Amino acid sequence: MAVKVAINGFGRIGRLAFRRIQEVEGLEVVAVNDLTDDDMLAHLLKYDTMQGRFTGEVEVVDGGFRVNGKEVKSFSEPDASKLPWKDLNIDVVLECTGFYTDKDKAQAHIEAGAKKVLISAPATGDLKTIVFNTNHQELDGSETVVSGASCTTNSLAPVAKVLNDDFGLVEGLMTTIHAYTGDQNTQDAPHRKGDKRRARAAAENIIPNSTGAAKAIGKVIPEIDGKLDGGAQRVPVATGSLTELTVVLEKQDVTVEQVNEAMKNASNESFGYTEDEIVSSDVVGMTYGSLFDATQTRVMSVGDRQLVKVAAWYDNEMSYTAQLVRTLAYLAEL
Amino acid sequence: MAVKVAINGFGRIGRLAFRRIQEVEGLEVVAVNDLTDDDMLAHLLKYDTMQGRFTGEVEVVDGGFRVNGKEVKSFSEPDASKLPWKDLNIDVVLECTGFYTDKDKAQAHIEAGAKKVLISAPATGDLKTIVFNTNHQELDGSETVVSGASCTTNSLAPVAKVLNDDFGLVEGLMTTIHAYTGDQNTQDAPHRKGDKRRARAAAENIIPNSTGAAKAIGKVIPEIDGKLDGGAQRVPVATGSLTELTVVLEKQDVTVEQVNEAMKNASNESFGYTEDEIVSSDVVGMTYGSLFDATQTRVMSVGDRQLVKVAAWYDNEMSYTAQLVRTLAYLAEL
Amino acid sequence: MAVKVAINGFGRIGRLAFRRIQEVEGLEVVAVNDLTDDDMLAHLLKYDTMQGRFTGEVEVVDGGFRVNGKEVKSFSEPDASKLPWKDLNIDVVLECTGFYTDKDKAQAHIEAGAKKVLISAPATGDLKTIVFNTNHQELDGSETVVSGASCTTNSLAPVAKVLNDDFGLVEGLMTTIHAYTGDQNTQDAPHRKGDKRRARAAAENIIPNSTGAAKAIGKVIPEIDGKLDGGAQRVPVATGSLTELTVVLEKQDVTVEQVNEAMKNASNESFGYTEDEIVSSDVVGMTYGSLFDATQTRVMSVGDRQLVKVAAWYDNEMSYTAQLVRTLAYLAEL
Amino acid sequence: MAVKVAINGFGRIGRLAFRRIQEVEGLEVVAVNDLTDDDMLAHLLKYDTMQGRFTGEVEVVDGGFRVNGKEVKSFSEPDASKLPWKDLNIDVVLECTGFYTDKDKAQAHIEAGAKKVLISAPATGDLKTIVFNTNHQELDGSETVVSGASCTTNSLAPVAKVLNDDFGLVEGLMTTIHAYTGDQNTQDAPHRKGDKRRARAAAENIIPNSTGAAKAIGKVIPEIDGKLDGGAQRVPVATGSLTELTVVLEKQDVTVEQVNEAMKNASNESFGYTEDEIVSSDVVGMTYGSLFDATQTRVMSVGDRQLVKVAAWYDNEMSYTAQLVRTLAYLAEL
């Protein structure tokens, strides 16, 4: 009956995908692969600084752990191709290590015996990049490796698609005021990728930086390829982020009410709408991929010439996870 | 000899203006008025969380306190018009309470006996609004009440003026990623002005909010009145902010290097220039009113149509204070 | 059929008590009094930075608001004696303003027409001070004004009671590493009670300070009156605290296992026990008044002479609140 | 004829030792070894989140960098014994990597050609452990490898020595409320040494943990070996810490005044004394190894039996660094 999921990399996304898959029927996590030990993994599953105590029960058993009476096998294998995916009958691997963000590298899971692989990051090579409820329709079923884009990309796609479809997108720039991630440093130190800004103390600074969304958007919405670009400001909150988008449009007498109303009409399970004066902590744990915030809509008009600004909240952890799981369910049924 | 300054409201700006006036000759702080007691005031002058230990010496004496052997009189008077400004021979009152941000209300200092009043915030009524080195030239000497604009306005004016003068500003939107201020709440609580967002825990949230700069900019640069607008994102750093500006320009083939070079050429004591990949804490205590950050310049080109984004750092405390003291000095010598 | 509660002061404790009263049958909040407006109050009930979104539904109606279809009346009355408690049939007032922490002052609610008043803080005068499951048994029913002690006092009582009962408490000192509260400043500023330390930036400092538990403990456990004292270190977390207690005991060969086992055996609904290496954010929202942490037990032995150190976690918000509502329920049924 | 210093590991301590050595004559940093690249190194020297902009001038030149016109050679060598210490005429290596905290491992610097090695951490094997102005006197000059103890050990030694010498120390327990360090995680993640608590988000939790001071104290003050023990609470401030010590003494009628006066009398360049109601940020960048805080002295008396509590501030970064450089200067001159 149920789809067999294996998670590669029990990091923030992996553990959160695990939690979310608990609320979805027809999906079981049967395997978890990470290089850390099980005591540490069970402990980090049980307790989460921003996302709260894990509601079920977690105990380390022989071949891995038992979560709510169910067995999850665990491995400590740094080379994906070795993994017992064949033996275990994996339907889809949720690839969250960061170390396989390439169609050809991610192929190792298929050799090891898995049917499909969903990469929880933008990925290079000949594959589809999917934001659920924006372009998942482009999955036919034959694909064996799929990127699930990025957290910011998921916050951006539904907003740009409305803007483009209803008003015609000429060009836009974007800033995500974005929570700090574990790839940033606790104290000023050398950084892994030589990034002089990720090098700095994460929780004490506004840190300018790049975004996946910037380049990976034209992959989700081909008709606006090359028309958006932008970056991030990493700031001292541990999760919860906000995308601001400033654009020029074809349509001529755009009003604040027009924009909001267009977004309200496009809302669904993936794309929320709010008129409440909320703040970042109010979206910690939410399962919308993107929450349009109508209170932040601005329109600058100077003669016939307009600049339109909008903003959308997202839990860069849970919102992205929720979107990823949705893509996973859909992918598993083709 | 030296210009006699009285500070009204020994808050963040007041105390920091006091510190700064120590480094400037021809200006003495002779009076300080605030409704708290002297022990508390001397303590808060001596010790500063973000700005460091006060370098001199501070002790509570009879009529107030002694700072580096100099006597500062202190008062506890909630009605400004009562104050002994006449008796003390105040040349200028630095007005920092928040409660006199109006030409007519601030007139109370002139009645009480002071020559001029500089308001450390945007103010209402018939008065000039001054950003030093952008439009201080518009002071002729007869003015008796002057607004010193806002911190964000000071971060913005030199940037917009270069943009307008060299490229022609059609329109622009702005976001300041801005440190939290004492008008925000420690924990989620009722707020004094009914602001549902400033109501929230300051150091635990990205908090969308409004900016003084938005409206008060056309007062500093009349030729761009009504052409900019924007807001803030209050974030968990205690001081240090960054203004991002996204604009449309008249000039047609604008490059990143064009913009940066324009800004570098306009740099002075008020307006800095940097190419160093810095972060917010890197500007804590800086005395530029605005620091242009050439690493953040971005230009989006789609056919003949460009969007230009620039960003300038500022210490919303010290940067603004340094600008304010400059305006003070200049005003005193007319 | 249900007990009628009116909450005075819709601060952190008031709103959280309101939330908690939702899960408890036989208690209805029918009135809420606070000096702010209803839009603000409904908003702050709906959204909580640390404690999450309010699960039900909240909307502003005519005489106050509707929570999950139930009507709550709201008032804006600064003199408690005026309040329509008589007219409303209030059984108990949960007094959470801070401004009535005295038997004689709190009497104003009884005049206004309420049966009993439970003060959510230590209070002065001739009244009982109660920590549920430590000494609630001392309520006979005739009392009309009761103190619910403090958050820290609630974290400490069950621990000290076990220590005293099983080993004999000679003397002890205590430190609570304690989350910052809304009585502390956002930025270095004058403070309302002249506290030079509460004056300081709350989220940027380890701030030494006093505790309610210090003096209010002998009121809960008379037999150890004058035997404990201690303070607080306010630190940059928004909720979640930890009490460390260092003691000298009568019993002679105390082991770590002895202490832990004694605590484990005394555990109940109010007083939890754990051996998991948790951290503060792990107790956000917990309903134990005190959670003993057996991983932190330490025994120092030099010859026949021992120093025993123990530690107990508490959500100084929700832990205290759950305790307070328990006392409330019990008081209402006498 | 100035002393030639080489720094191994340009981390927080290394960079701060470099800064400090600028203010000390007779000491030159001529070499710096770290595995990161020079651009990163120059950048992190120039800019410091907590300790401010580097006051001189730093530019990347050929064999390393130029600081205030002076040449500093830089290497990228993971095996210390290879390093050109002989060729460069190093007098002392300041060893700050963390990876050579053992007399036998640190011997590699002597092989590579340095005269002496001072390890900026507690170290194992046959060597002296020094806290300047507490026991530096025990250096005779023949030693070639020395440990400089730990930051907390330095905050503790002068206080314990006074307590022991004046009142006679029976036993004590200790907690340092301690700034988070770079060895803690930004977000909940696996930890390098399997530490379930260092694993957690550093800036969002009170995190119980261990301390170097606990065991390394009897090495500095042999007469109190085995008489103290204690731990840490890592809390969300980036630097600035506080040691609380709870002790039992021989002397019988100890008063608060007695203790404070004893500490006041023992104060020097390494050991400060204050009666100001300060907080953590007030000690960032201070050069005392330890600052006794007479406002936190408590004495619990029940009959003839007392518990005495004291507390001392220290910038676990700069205070420790200042102590380390003093030990360095002294070691160099034997």
Ligand SMILES: *C(=O)[C@H](O)COP(=O)(O)O
């Ligand atoms: C979200 O997937 C990640 O934390 C941040 O990168 P973006 O490029 O901001 O998505």
Ligand SMILES: *C(=O)[C@H](O)COP(=O)(O)O
């Ligand atoms: C500085 O003026 C103060 O923070 C207010 O901020 P604005 O962004 O200038 O309104």
Ligand SMILES: *C(=O)[C@H](O)COP(=O)(O)O
């Ligand atoms: C909890 O009631 C409140 O924060 C007071 O803390 P204490 O340290 O218990 O006074």
Ligand SMILES: *C(=O)[C@H](O)COP(=O)(O)O
């Ligand atoms: C100080 O050297 C470093 O932060 C380690 O702290 P301890 O508590 O002294 O181990």
Ligand SMILES: [Cl-]
């Ligand atoms: Cl403000």
Ligand SMILES: [Cl-]
């Ligand atoms: Cl309080």
Ligand SMILES: [Cl-]
């Ligand atoms: Cl460490």
